[PDB]
Design a protein around this ligand. Structure first.
Ligand SMILES: Nc1nc2c(ncn2[C@@H]2O[C@H](COP(=O)(O)OP(=O)(O)OP(=O)(O)O)[C@@H](O)[C@H]2O)c(=O)[nH]1
Ligand SMILES: Nc1nc2c(ncn2[C@@H]2O[C@H](COP(=O)(O)OP(=O)(O)O)[C@@H](O)[C@H]2O)c(=O)[nH]1
Ligand SMILES: Nc1nc2c(ncn2[C@@H]2O[C@H](COP(=O)(O)OP(=O)(O)O)[C@@H](O)[C@H]2O)c(=O)[nH]1
Ligand SMILES: [Mg+2]
Lengths: 52, 49, 50, 192, 427, 430, 427
């Protein structure tokens, strides 16, 4: 009985290991892009000026 | 006897690591939303412009 | 007057250099003297054992 | 040649990343074809990667040479009973125990036992606290952020890769503990 | 100010209290007779909690020490801090309660109950706002199981409000001291579930483990086991006798450690219990006194808490400490073991902090934790009960003393129910 | 109101700065404590008297950056901008740029942004690191990636410790050098190159003292930085700022790698015996022996050169000091850049550090030029990479640190075009 | 701050291990009781690398001591610096391992391995940035290899990102001290090739001569021999506990060394090893130390480097010196002696300079070297194994405790393929 609840939790741990890895990679795409997020708006702010 | 004993200590560690894993997954998925809210904020002023 | 009040703040804020550093040195001796006091208490209980 | 690719690939496998390890395992196959030692090493690295079918291919293509490699005898854990339905994998767990005892084989034997006798609500029951992740990794797919490119692959691929394994683990947990058996356990407990 | 009227009942209790009264006597200063000789007013200040003022500045304790065999009380006098006890608050019968719940709860005992209730009444209404009415005793004997649970009963009728703590000794799992242990214990756990409001299960088998697997001792005397228990007590009543940053008395450690009327059986546990050779090699950072408390070992009750889901845990911390280190470390516990803490209650942990530490240390704690693992304790006792009533063994000595069989069955039922309910909330 | 931010990164970059910030403390009369007994460009003022240097010292290994915050200069630096690390780089590009680099960026750039807000007229940046070390290669190139998008048009000058041709310290050093040059090509402005063994050579011959160490090595590097930036603060006859170095050191955006040279590097005894005139100190720059990087100038062609003078230099005798250079044939000038030269004049003679081996001269010139003889210096480093990568030598650590192998092939491919530009520069056009 | 747990398991381990702690406290100024009593401050600034602080000066060493039969461990206790270690750390069983890998890696081993990893896990959580582990096995043997391998493997599965250096005595070439040493080695080397990062072959026959030829000691005991092996461990890890010009953490000294992920076996070496009254006739300059440094007569391993090809060599110089001189002498080496160095990695030498000299020695310079010549050692053990496995010698005393022949066959295959890997680069 105790091995059966060890391997079941060993199974349950790894499917929580994966979800950490797919969320950190999802973070990394949002983080780098938040840097280019401002100057794109600044460029388009000047776009409203140039066609004014 | 020691088998059962060592196996208790083992199961504990496994269920405890799973727990701290859910924790970091929960420290995230809140800060993931903290990277989605300004993500759901510029494109409303991008689509404005 | 603006020069000597920034200088006045200069002496006033460097007194918090010496007060807080001395407080830190007084705090570490206070917890150290607690360690000897618990150990000299253990010296007294080891007496009545002896 | 071959000894570099194993040693990094086994170390990468232990170090948490499995995608890059399997690549290092796969490059070693372009040194010698029938290499049972490494064929099981892929299937260890491929079961952990969420997907299932390639791991079985490497599992079988290992043990199509000789049934003597005890490390590869461990690998067939991923057969039917543990992957679905309600009976098979014990037929090999016992024949592995006919070989060297290998206390890890017994773990599979005690697991493959009397369990052979056996949307929101179903997901929350079958999946544990990671069911909060499952819906949330599906509610993040109803946006425009999906159509992106991280490195070679797409952001929508990753948002569905985590959902793919969680859906795969959903049936894996359902096969082990049936919903029908769950009602019987609760009813017998309350009555007694 | 509030006070507590100890009801040292039973042989085991007589002893459990004696080492305890010495422990509180010291913390406060009351020397082996009474004259306060402390080194900080912080002590005397609120002594009323466990000590009544007399003349010549004497602080005789407030303990209606009781028994049914005039011998244990006699030893309690002829001991260390024993002159303190009053020569009138010792209620002693003549006929022993030969290990027979009946002899103590229905026959021999009763005779003494009137005298006990009298003294209790007296020392009780001689206060301003009594806060409690503890009763240290064992559940596997005669006087305790018998007269003890009758006192608890008539007292919860006379004063129907004051907290009724009951540091109790539940029969050990493996080795036992008596043979008729089951019957006695089972019967006592029925006149305790629907009466007391804070029972603390302490087990000897468990205690021994914490005096050989943690205290690296080799010759543990029943006395040394009693000192570990006395420490738990001091702690549960510390934030009321000495000031602090987040004080919590008994009523609070209740509205924050019992999630259902019946469910009231809590397991204890101390914090800094290290050996001599190691006393110096270990540091006392709050993290350390937190690890040595949530472990299954440092639990004075032999019921692995790894097989249940703590409905709620507490922590009467004691010692000048950092409220951050405490709350922070307690969140790490709250999360690291979220799979061992029930979810229907979001946050399960009460964190009190005192200032005056246990005499000679730097920090301490008590792990009063309501777990669904106590279900196992009663089930082992019940497994034994149903395995004796089945053949009406050792029952001719009970039915005799005005006792019916339905009473016995009613205990199995009211015990089976506790165990059953405990599991319903463990799911 | 015209300041510039200097970021020093790595084991190398910090120890350069400790021997460089002692020069700014001694030129301005700054005390080690931080109070006076103009400053503006390299020192701030917290309205009280305690001068704070506008420098951020970032490193991944705490054991060296701890010496700055415990030694004599502990009161001068802000304790929170002087940021330490938690895990070390281990000479890995894949660690300081992909694994442990990314965890020390959400606050390091926050320091640079706050130091940018304190200024009003910033125009330049200044970076010290080494191409060989893991922090000076990986963490530097991430900073180039971050500063290219955060600031952009602002100038980003650079000083490096080049791979020594003959000796070396690390053996994955060519691995670090190629990958850091890959990122520096497009995300940097001008990368001033200095190596180790040539300074060891000029400390033997010109300087009388033997057995040199990192103290004398970094004080000379402190001198080349102090000489190149002294024109911001002191009034001179012909002044020059950092954004001016953009347009006259690089003709093409791919080449941005010039060299340094300190001319009056002389001992205390030897300066008694010769007079230092600006005619003689100018053609002492061009000798290959005095060159601070081991690149023989006769192999290459001079593309553009900068001569920043200090002290009582007379501009009457600087054009005569240059007209002698162009008439002699050992310096190669051809048609596609017949101009080739500039000078900058300052009125501050170079200071002397107590205990230093330099002599307190008044006519100090620093020669700053980019040559096509860097091609042969890079003709071995790409060969160095092609001799190790030819059978996959040490790169299993890199692919163990978040690195995919695929960039190494295009690190070759992007670097292979670089000397293809060099052969296009050297050919004459008819 | 980086941390290094010193796992010592076995007679030769707990022996040199003790010496290691003596030749480390002296530097960090610690007494045989646990209290800083040194001169310069730079000494307790980085005590957080091998010594965790306790209460008030007691720097309790972070060493886990393991064996199988109370003996070698008791020697470390009843000795000089012997009580500094925390009691718990001393984890021992009761039976011996009669140099039988099977015992230490199968039958018994496991019994204690669980406890061993417990203390390790605990002292791993008490770290800011775990750099790695530092095992100390005697290989050829039981409690040494048998256990170490088990522990080494467990650690690499728990911490797959730590540099586990394994100073190990290699089955001596000439006179062995165990009739079954070949057997042990075969299985051992196999595990420490897929589970380690920087091994250091500390052979004995070599050390027993370096003290006879260089130090000219008339009666070299094990005591003196261990001062040499201890010194190297302190050198490898000197830039992690003291300031310097070109620091080099273990990870650095590994990346710049371990070439392909398997040839990670290195040859140890110290620098100023002159006799007592011979110093007068010998200077101490980088030039001089380098002659000795690279002299193959001062290598603590047996194989002669002038019979192979130095793949990558490093040197952690400790002392106030001139980086120029360091580079100049190292440059000359690569040039003067080129054939003896491999050519596919031009820069073949790594220099490092910690600026805190050793006790009573102005300039010390530990040298670590990945020399292909190690083929000899591997081949020798393989050869000796070949002779025994053949006529199935002492095998019922190995396979008797669970170890199929195929295990030892697999082992041989690996050990031999390591020789192939090395020679493939020599040519
Ligand atoms: N001129 C000069 N060069 C230095 C100094 N310190 C280190 N270096 C150079 O740095 C190169 C190797 O880099 P490292 O020693 O690893 O230092 P790093 O570049 O900061 O890399 P990390 O140590 O990982 O942080 C050597 O070849 C040296 O030439 C210094 O103080 N002055
Ligand atoms: N912890 C502890 N338990 C005791 C002590 N003395 C007796 N006991 C327990 O109490 C039981 C003895 O019964 P006893 O107290 O004489 O019965 P009672 O007085 O009639 O209720 C045994 O099962 C012991 O476990 C003691 O000093 N310490
Ligand atoms: N360096 C060193 N080596 C030792 C010492 N004692 C024994 N050895 C070596 O250890 C080898 C035998 O190891 P062994 O005693 O079997 O280790 P065990 O299996 O763990 O008990 C011999 O070849 C010795 O050379 C010592 O104090 N120092
Ligand atoms: Mg560094």
């Amino acid at each position: 009985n105790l091995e059966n609840r060890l391997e079941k939790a060993r199974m349950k741990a790894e499917e929580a290991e994966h979800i950490t890895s797919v969320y950190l990679q999802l973070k990394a795409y949002l983080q780098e892009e938040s840097l280019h997020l401002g100057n794109r708006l600044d460029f388009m702010e000047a776009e409203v000026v140039r066609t004014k | 006897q020691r088998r059962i004993k060592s196996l208790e200590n083992q199961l504990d560690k496994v269920i405890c690591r799973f727990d701290i894993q859910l924790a970091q997954n929960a420290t995230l998925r809140e800060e993931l939303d903290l990277l989605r809210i300004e993500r759901n904020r510029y494109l409303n002023v991008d689509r404005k412009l | 007057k603006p020069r000597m009040k920034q200088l006045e703040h200069k002496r006033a804020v460097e007194k918090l250099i010496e007060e807080r550093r001395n407080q830190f040195l007084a705090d570490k001796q206070r917890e150290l003297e607690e360690w000897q006091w618990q150990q000299r208490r253990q010296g007294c209980i080891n007496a009545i054992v002896e | 040649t071959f000894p570099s690719y194993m040693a990094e690939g086994e170390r990468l496998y232990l170090c948490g990343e499995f995608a890059k390890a399997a690549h290092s395992f796969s490059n070693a196959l372009h040194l010698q074809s029938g290499d049972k030692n490494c064929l099981v090493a892929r299937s260890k690295c491929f079961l952990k990667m969420g997907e299932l079918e390639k791991s079985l291919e490497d599992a079988e293509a290992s043990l199509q040479g000789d049934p003597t490699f005890c490390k590869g005898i461990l690998q067939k854990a991923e057969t039917l009973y543990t992957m679905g339905d309600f009976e098979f994998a014990l037929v090999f767990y016992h024949r592995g125990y006919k070989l060297r005892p290998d206390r890890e084989f017994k773990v599979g034997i005690q697991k493959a036992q009397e369990a052979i006798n056996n949307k929101i609500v179903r997901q929350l029951l079958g999946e544990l606290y990671v069911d909060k992740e499952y819906l949330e990794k599906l509610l993040l797919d109803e946006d425009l952020i999906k159509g992106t490119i991280k490195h070679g692959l797409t952001v929508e691929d990753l948002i569905m890769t985590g959902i793919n394994y969680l859906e795969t683990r959903s049936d894996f947990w359902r096969q082990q503990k049936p919903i029908y058996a769950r009602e019987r356990d609760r009813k017998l407990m309350q009555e007694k | 100010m509030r006070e507590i009227v100890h009801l040292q009942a039973g042989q085991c209790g007589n002893q459990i209290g004696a080492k305890f009264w010495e422990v509180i006597s010291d913390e406060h200063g009351i020397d082996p007779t009474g004259t306060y000789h402390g080194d900080s007013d912080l002590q005397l200040e609120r002594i009323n909690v466990y000590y009544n003022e007399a003349t010549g500045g004497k602080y005789v304790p407030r303990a209606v020490l009781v028994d049914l065999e005039p011998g244990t009380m006699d030893s309690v006098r002829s001991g260390p801090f024993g002159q303190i006890f009053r020569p009138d608050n010792f209620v002693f019968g003549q006929s022993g309660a030969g290990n027979n719940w009946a002899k103590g709860h229905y026959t021999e005992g009763a005779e003494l109950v009137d005298s006990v209730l009298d003294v209790v009444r007296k020392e009780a209404e001689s206060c301003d706002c009594l806060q409690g009415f503890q009763l240290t005793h064992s559940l596997g004997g005669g006087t305790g199981s018998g007269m003890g649970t009758l006192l608890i009963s008539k007292i919860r009728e006379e004063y129907p409000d004051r907290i009724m703590n009951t540091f109790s000794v539940v029969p050990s799992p493996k080795v036992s001291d008596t043979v008729v242990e089951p019957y006695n214990a089972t019967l006592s756990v029925h006149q305790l579930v629907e009466n007391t409001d804070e029972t603390y299960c302490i087990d000897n088998e468990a205690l021994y483990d914490i005096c050989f697997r943690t205290l690296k001792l080799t010759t543990p005397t029943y006395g040394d086991l009693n000192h570990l228990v006395s420490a738990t007590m001091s702690g549960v009543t510390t934030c009321l006798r000495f000031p602090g940053q987040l004080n919590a008395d008994l009523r609070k450690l209740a509205v924050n450690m019992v999630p259902f009327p019946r469910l009231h059986f809590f397991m204890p546990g101390f914090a800094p219990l290290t050996s001599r050779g190691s006393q110096q090699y270990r540091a006392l950072t709050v993290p350390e006194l937190t690890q040595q408390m949530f472990d299954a070992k440092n639990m004075m009750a032999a019921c692995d808490p790894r097989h249940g889901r703590y409905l709620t845990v507490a922590a009467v911390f004691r010692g000048r400490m950092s409220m951050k280190e405490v709350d922070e470390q307690m969140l790490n516990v709250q999360n690291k073991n979220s799979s061992y803490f029930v979810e229907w209650i979001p946050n399960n942990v009460k964190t009190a902090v005192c200032d005056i530490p246990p005499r000679g240390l730097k920090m301490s704690a008590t792990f009063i934790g309501n777990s669904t693992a106590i279900q196992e304790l009663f089930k082992r006792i019940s497994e034994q009960f149903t395995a004796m009533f089945r053949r009406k063994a050792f029952l001719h000595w009970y039915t005799g003393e005005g006792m019916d069989e339905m009473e016995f069955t009613e205990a199995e039922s009211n015990m089976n129910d506790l165990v059953s309910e405990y599991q319903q909330y463990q799911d | 109101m015209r300041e510039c931010i200097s970021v020093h990164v790595g084991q190398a970059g910090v120890q350069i700065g400790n021997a460089c910030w002692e020069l700014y403390c001694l030129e301005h009369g700054i005390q080690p404590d931080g109070q006076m007994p103009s400053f503006n460009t390299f020192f701030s003022e917290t309205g009280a008297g305690k001068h704070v240097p506008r420098a951020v010292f970032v490193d991944l290994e705490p054991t060296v950056i701890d010496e700055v915050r415990t030694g004599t200069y502990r009161q001068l630096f802000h304790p929170e901008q002087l940021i330490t690390g938690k895990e070390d780089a281990a000479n890995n590009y894949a660690r300081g740029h992909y694994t442990i680099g990314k965890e020390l960026i959400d606050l390091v750039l926050d320091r640079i942004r706050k130091l940018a807000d304190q200024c009003t007229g910033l125009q330049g940046f200044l970076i010290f690191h080494s191409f060989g070390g893991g922090t000076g290669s990986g963490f530097t190139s991430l900073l180039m990636e971050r500063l290219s998008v955060d600031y952009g048009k602002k100038s980003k000058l650079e000083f490096s410790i080049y791979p020594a041709p003959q000796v070396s310290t690390a053996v994955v050093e060519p691995y670090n050098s190629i990958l850091t040059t890959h990122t520096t090509l497009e995300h940097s402005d001008c990368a001033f190159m200095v190596d180790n063994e040539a300074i060891y050579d000029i400390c033997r011959r010109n300087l009388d003292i033997e057995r040199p160490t990192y103290t004398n090595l970094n004080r000379l590097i402190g001198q080349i930085v102090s000489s190149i930036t002294a024109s911001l603060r002191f009034d001179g006859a012909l002044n020059v700022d950092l954004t001016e170095f953009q347009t006259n050191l690089v003709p093409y955006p791919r080449i941005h790698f010039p060299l340094a040279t300190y001319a009056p590097v002389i001992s205390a005894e030897k300066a008694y015996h010769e007079q230092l005139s600006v005619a003689e100190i100018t053609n002492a720059c061009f000798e290959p022996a005095n060159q601070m990087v081991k690149c023989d100038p006769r192999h290459g062609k001079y593309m553009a050169c900068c001569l920043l003078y200090r002290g009582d230099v007379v501009p009457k005798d600087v054009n005569a000091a240059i007209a002698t250079i162009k008439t002699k044939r050992t310096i190669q000038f051809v048609d596609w850049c017949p101009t080739g030269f500039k000078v900058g004049i300052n009125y501050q003679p170079p200071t002397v550090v107590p205990g230093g081996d330099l002599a307190k001269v008044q006519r100090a010139v620093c020669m700053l030029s980019n040559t096509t003889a860097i091609a042969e210096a890079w003709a071995r480093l790409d060969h160095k990479f092609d001799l190790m990568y030819a059978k996959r030598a040490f790169v299993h650590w890199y692919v163990g640190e978040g690195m995919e192998e695929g960039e190494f092939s295009e690190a070759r491919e992007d670097m292979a075009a670089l000397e293809k530009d060099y052969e296009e520069v050297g050919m004459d056009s008819v």
